[PDB]
Amino acid sequence: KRIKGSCTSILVGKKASIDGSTLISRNDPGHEALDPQRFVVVNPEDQPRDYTSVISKVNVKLPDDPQRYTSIPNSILTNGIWPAAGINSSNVAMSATETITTNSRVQGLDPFVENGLGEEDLVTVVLPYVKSAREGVKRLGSLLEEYGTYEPNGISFADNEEVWWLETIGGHHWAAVRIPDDAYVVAPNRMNIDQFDFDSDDTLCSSDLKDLIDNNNLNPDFENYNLRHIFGSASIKDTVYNNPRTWYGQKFFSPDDTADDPMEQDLPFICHANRKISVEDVKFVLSSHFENTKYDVYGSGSQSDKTLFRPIGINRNHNVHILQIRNNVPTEIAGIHWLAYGANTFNTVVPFYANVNDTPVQYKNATGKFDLNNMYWLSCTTALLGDTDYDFYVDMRNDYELDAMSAYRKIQNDTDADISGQKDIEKYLENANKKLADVAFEKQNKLLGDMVTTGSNNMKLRYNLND
Amino acid sequence: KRIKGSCTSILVGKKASIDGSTLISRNDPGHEALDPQRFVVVNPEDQPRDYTSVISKVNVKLPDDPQRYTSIPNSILTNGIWPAAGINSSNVAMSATETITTNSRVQGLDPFVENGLGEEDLVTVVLPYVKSAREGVKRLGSLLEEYGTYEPNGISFADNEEVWWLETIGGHHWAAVRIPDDAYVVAPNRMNIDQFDFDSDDTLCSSDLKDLIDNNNLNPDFENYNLRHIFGSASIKDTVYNNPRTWYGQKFFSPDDTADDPMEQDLPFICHANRKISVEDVKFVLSSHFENTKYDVYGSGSQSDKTLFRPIGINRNHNVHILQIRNNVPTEIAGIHWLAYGANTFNTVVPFYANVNDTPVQYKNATGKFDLNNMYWLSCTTALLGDTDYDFYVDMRNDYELDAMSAYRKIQNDTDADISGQKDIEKYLENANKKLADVAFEKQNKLLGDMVTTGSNNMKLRYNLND
Ligand SMILES: [Co+2]
Ligand SMILES: [Co+2]
Ligand SMILES: [Co+2]
């Protein structure tokens, strides 16, 4: 047995969002436990042409024309801080942090390959060599066929037009679905793809997948093809660890199409919300642990409805990551990395422009010993002070996030609105990303001050007396 | 009154399964507690021609042409280790470990015969002399009429075409139903056969059964014949000990045709699933404790709608045995003994080929004192280590079972795919069986290492903390 944790992905098609962007997202648990959030640029320079896989050490030959891409690194690993997600210079987004499920019937036919690729390799070997989400699908599929994989994975791709969800199937097979423009998906650590039309333009798969199913008695259904019925799981672990997370998201976006059983094994894959979806919505769902009277995590009653469902995106590590490819803006400022910051219950997402060659100084320094001029330690301070009397800080937490998002959006809007006469767009965007980093810091500083100010004024008469 | 245990049987017709096989199954009563369980081949020589019944010592003369059959034994008795189930060289499967019920009106007419056959005799005196599921039914019926029985029993027979369920009735009578091709049955320790057509090609019974009923006011119903209404029980014990097990299986396979009362006395015998049934499905149901939200064994809060409704297969004594006769392959490799291994919450089923003259060296040795090279002792260790922190080990346990099953199926598929050019099929299958026993061992060995490794690092920062 080995490594890896719990993740929830939300995909939004370009007509399903409030601003016409595509959205792919994820929340992330860490394995060891320090979470300084960094984002990194990988220039064609730094891209290997003879790549060696992280766990398996197999050697992979990569094309010689890699695109610059921005990367979001991860946990403790067995070989270097591999990219979990990213946006390349063609505005293609990819995220490969969603472990899914399988079953023993297909594994008996196409087993995990112990010397295969793992999810740690996927962004590196796919993202720099494709100019569309759909190319991302075909290239990854072709690489699974060639090198195999030792894991069950779900991978999201997006560009300004399309969103694709790819699922690996056994050691070498795969299947993928184009999310409709007006649709959204909530996907936990369980194989998600349901009804599947091999003919469709909206689908892609191993060229032998249908024959693989038909010739080996893999299909449990009397009619049609449901890929997660065929290749996935419907286990006991799913009902408490995966399905309630799907259910919760679908209850939020589609309250009138979603019944009341968080354990349901056949919640639809593709959904239609009753309204357009914002970045704030996605952030909330990826942050929120089922909270209305039902399933806190936790407080006032019940706990006969509790302890045994799985919180999102809290257990914790709490990093929400949202990749947005916008429309109706010049293509050079379209790619946005909404990066987590962080941390505890005081996390926000900061909208960095992805189209840059260098990063704000904060994300290459240390992050050595405690220093309140450093964003990490300031966050840790705010985090720790937060659990003092935490529902004395619950209402100033919501104001903090609101006020910080507001400040981030002001910068994004001002930057977008003044793009037209700029002679150096890349430096222009570097400067915006540095304004964002600065206000993210200033906001948490204002937060530390407000907590201490009102805390010292409450602790003062939690000690009881006088007029 | 005297000996015996709790059993649940599941029967699947050849069009009801995912792979075109017939399935008969049972989970296994603990006798006392010796649960290293054997796999045994019985050659025609070792078959008595003058058989002596186990308890009653009555003498039964058997034909002189017995077929080779594989047998699955037990522990404690007053005489030996009788075969509970088996597959013969004609690919007929039989299982006789399902005690049922009766009533005083039929017993008042045809009492149990104190010196008759009991379930310990049935496989031995039926299986070696029949070439079809249906012949097994006719022979058992004839043997009950002749020697009588002291018990109420349910017996399943299968070949590659048909599945039959026979129920003994009083001292000498019996009735049997052919399970339809597209149907399945969940049958606990209660007389199961309901609506009954004497005329039918799909039924067999005592030639006087209808007359017995009509002439003795045995029929409680205004119209037609329901055999368990007439001959069986609808008792208080049935509502908590039998019916919930039936209900649970029917909820799992036929969720939209099954209501929500587990105590229901009139759940149908024959059922139609909403999907095709896998070996994995059958294993899960025969293993599973009634879970989720309502009634575990045991759990959530608060424990009186959580009950005297009892777990199958937790009492505990979890040996799942599935007899499969495949179609889809040559007849020489069609009979599969899915055998338990085992044990505690750490059991899997291994698909041993039944068409062999010898058994893996595993099931011929001692079974002496503690030795970690022995499958039994290795199993006890992982089992005991399992109840330290039982849901620190539950998620690596679901992966253990999944991963072992996959490795088994890989071997099964490879063995099957290369059968046509084999010159010594018997030696070929013995070798495959030895691969299976080995990998099952190897897989349990890897589990011990993984359990100890993760255990050694979690209880170790019961430090209560810090990096
Ligand atoms: Co067509
Ligand atoms: Co350009
Ligand atoms: Co039918």
PDB file of C-alpha atoms in Angstrom, chain A residues 1-2 32 34 101-112 215-222 229-230 234-237 239-241 261 263 265-266 303-309, chain B residues 15-16 18-20 248 252 273-281 284 291-293 300-302 328 395-403 405-407 409-411 413-414 446 450 467:
ATOM      1  CA  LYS A   1       0.000   0.000   0.000  1.00  0.00           C
ATOM      2  CA  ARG A   2       1.023   3.633  -0.381  1.00  0.00           C
ATOM      3  CA  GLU A  32       3.274  15.858   5.946  1.00  0.00           C
ATOM      4  CA  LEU A  34       3.488  22.556   6.419  1.00  0.00           C
ATOM      5  CA  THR A 101     -11.517   4.277  -7.879  1.00  0.00           C
ATOM      6  CA  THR A 102     -11.506   0.973  -9.716  1.00  0.00           C
ATOM      7  CA  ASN A 103     -12.704  -2.646  -9.329  1.00  0.00           C
ATOM      8  CA  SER A 104     -11.117  -6.097  -9.512  1.00  0.00           C
ATOM      9  CA  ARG A 105     -12.831  -7.263 -12.715  1.00  0.00           C
ATOM     10  CA  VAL A 106     -11.095  -4.707 -14.981  1.00  0.00           C
ATOM     11  CA  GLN A 107      -7.891  -4.927 -12.911  1.00  0.00           C
ATOM     12  CA  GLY A 108      -7.896  -8.640 -13.667  1.00  0.00           C
ATOM     13  CA  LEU A 109      -7.735  -7.686 -17.360  1.00  0.00           C
ATOM     14  CA  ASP A 110      -5.575  -4.531 -17.410  1.00  0.00           C
ATOM     15  CA  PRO A 111      -3.691  -4.363 -14.074  1.00  0.00           C
ATOM     16  CA  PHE A 112      -1.893  -1.364 -12.624  1.00  0.00           C
ATOM     17  CA  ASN A 215     -15.793  -9.184 -25.028  1.00  0.00           C
ATOM     18  CA  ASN A 216     -15.007  -9.652 -21.364  1.00  0.00           C
ATOM     19  CA  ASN A 217     -18.403  -9.521 -19.645  1.00  0.00           C
ATOM     20  CA  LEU A 218     -17.518  -6.265 -17.851  1.00  0.00           C
ATOM     21  CA  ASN A 219     -20.919  -4.595 -18.322  1.00  0.00           C
ATOM     22  CA  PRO A 220     -23.294  -5.111 -15.387  1.00  0.00           C
ATOM     23  CA  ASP A 221     -26.175  -3.308 -17.076  1.00  0.00           C
ATOM     24  CA  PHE A 222     -28.893  -4.707 -19.315  1.00  0.00           C
ATOM     25  CA  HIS A 229     -20.730   0.940 -13.279  1.00  0.00           C
ATOM     26  CA  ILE A 230     -18.352  -0.949 -15.582  1.00  0.00           C
ATOM     27  CA  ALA A 234     -19.986   1.538  -5.667  1.00  0.00           C
ATOM     28  CA  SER A 235     -18.551   0.536  -2.275  1.00  0.00           C
ATOM     29  CA  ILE A 236     -19.349   1.077   1.393  1.00  0.00           C
ATOM     30  CA  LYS A 237     -16.461   3.558   1.571  1.00  0.00           C
ATOM     31  CA  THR A 239     -21.290   6.182   0.544  1.00  0.00           C
ATOM     32  CA  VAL A 240     -19.630   8.060   3.422  1.00  0.00           C
ATOM     33  CA  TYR A 241     -16.329   9.281   1.957  1.00  0.00           C
ATOM     34  CA  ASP A 261     -29.693  11.100   0.230  1.00  0.00           C
ATOM     35  CA  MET A 263     -25.202   8.294   0.269  1.00  0.00           C
ATOM     36  CA  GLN A 265     -24.363   5.909  -5.515  1.00  0.00           C
ATOM     37  CA  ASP A 266     -25.941   7.159  -8.770  1.00  0.00           C
ATOM     38  CA  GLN A 303     -24.425  13.550  16.319  1.00  0.00           C
ATOM     39  CA  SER A 304     -26.557  10.656  15.247  1.00  0.00           C
ATOM     40  CA  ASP A 305     -26.232  12.226  11.811  1.00  0.00           C
ATOM     41  CA  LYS A 306     -22.486  12.342  12.601  1.00  0.00           C
ATOM     42  CA  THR A 307     -18.787  11.735  12.782  1.00  0.00           C
ATOM     43  CA  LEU A 308     -19.031   9.305   9.867  1.00  0.00           C
ATOM     44  CA  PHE A 309     -19.302  11.476   6.652  1.00  0.00           C
TER      45      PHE A 309
ATOM     46  CA  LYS B  15     -28.727 -14.996 -17.363  1.00  0.00           C
ATOM     47  CA  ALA B  16     -28.725 -13.124 -14.041  1.00  0.00           C
ATOM     48  CA  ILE B  18     -22.527 -10.599 -15.174  1.00  0.00           C
ATOM     49  CA  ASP B  19     -20.565 -13.397 -16.851  1.00  0.00           C
ATOM     50  CA  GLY B  20     -23.153 -15.996 -17.888  1.00  0.00           C
ATOM     51  CA  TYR B 248     -30.900  -6.803   3.105  1.00  0.00           C
ATOM     52  CA  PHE B 252     -29.012  -4.512  -2.419  1.00  0.00           C
ATOM     53  CA  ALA B 273     -32.073  -7.685  -9.877  1.00  0.00           C
ATOM     54  CA  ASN B 274     -31.765  -4.284 -11.521  1.00  0.00           C
ATOM     55  CA  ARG B 275     -28.412  -5.376 -12.944  1.00  0.00           C
ATOM     56  CA  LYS B 276     -26.266  -8.437 -13.582  1.00  0.00           C
ATOM     57  CA  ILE B 277     -24.600  -9.966 -10.509  1.00  0.00           C
ATOM     58  CA  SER B 278     -20.884 -10.440 -10.028  1.00  0.00           C
ATOM     59  CA  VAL B 279     -18.944 -12.781  -7.818  1.00  0.00           C
ATOM     60  CA  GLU B 280     -17.859  -9.626  -5.891  1.00  0.00           C
ATOM     61  CA  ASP B 281     -21.504  -8.647  -5.229  1.00  0.00           C
ATOM     62  CA  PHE B 284     -20.111  -8.572  -0.243  1.00  0.00           C
ATOM     63  CA  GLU B 291     -24.737  -0.887   6.725  1.00  0.00           C
ATOM     64  CA  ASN B 292     -25.456   2.265   6.485  1.00  0.00           C
ATOM     65  CA  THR B 293     -27.509   4.896   8.385  1.00  0.00           C
ATOM     66  CA  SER B 300     -24.013   5.064  15.110  1.00  0.00           C
ATOM     67  CA  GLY B 301     -26.533   6.208  17.828  1.00  0.00           C
ATOM     68  CA  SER B 302     -28.812   5.349  19.426  1.00  0.00           C
ATOM     69  CA  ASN B 328     -17.916 -18.705 -21.567  1.00  0.00           C
ATOM     70  CA  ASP B 395      -9.395   1.527   4.633  1.00  0.00           C
ATOM     71  CA  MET B 396      -6.251  -0.486   4.002  1.00  0.00           C
ATOM     72  CA  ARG B 397      -8.436  -3.499   4.439  1.00  0.00           C
ATOM     73  CA  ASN B 398     -10.811  -2.602   1.600  1.00  0.00           C
ATOM     74  CA  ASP B 399      -7.755  -2.092  -0.575  1.00  0.00           C
ATOM     75  CA  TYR B 400      -6.286  -5.402   0.544  1.00  0.00           C
ATOM     76  CA  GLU B 401      -9.400  -7.224  -0.628  1.00  0.00           C
ATOM     77  CA  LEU B 402      -9.632  -5.295  -3.911  1.00  0.00           C
ATOM     78  CA  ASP B 403      -5.935  -5.851  -4.703  1.00  0.00           C
ATOM     79  CA  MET B 405      -9.153 -10.152  -5.925  1.00  0.00           C
ATOM     80  CA  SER B 406      -7.507  -8.417  -8.897  1.00  0.00           C
ATOM     81  CA  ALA B 407      -4.421 -10.628  -8.616  1.00  0.00           C
ATOM     82  CA  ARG B 409      -8.623 -12.669 -11.500  1.00  0.00           C
ATOM     83  CA  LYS B 410      -5.420 -11.890 -13.393  1.00  0.00           C
ATOM     84  CA  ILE B 411      -4.307 -15.470 -12.753  1.00  0.00           C
ATOM     85  CA  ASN B 413      -7.832 -14.868 -16.918  1.00  0.00           C
ATOM     86  CA  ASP B 414      -4.255 -15.858 -17.895  1.00  0.00           C
ATOM     87  CA  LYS B 446       2.343  -7.805   2.350  1.00  0.00           C
ATOM     88  CA  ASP B 450       1.890  -2.708   5.730  1.00  0.00           C
ATOM     89  CA  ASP B 467       7.635  17.661  14.322  1.00  0.00           C
TER      90      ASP B 467
END
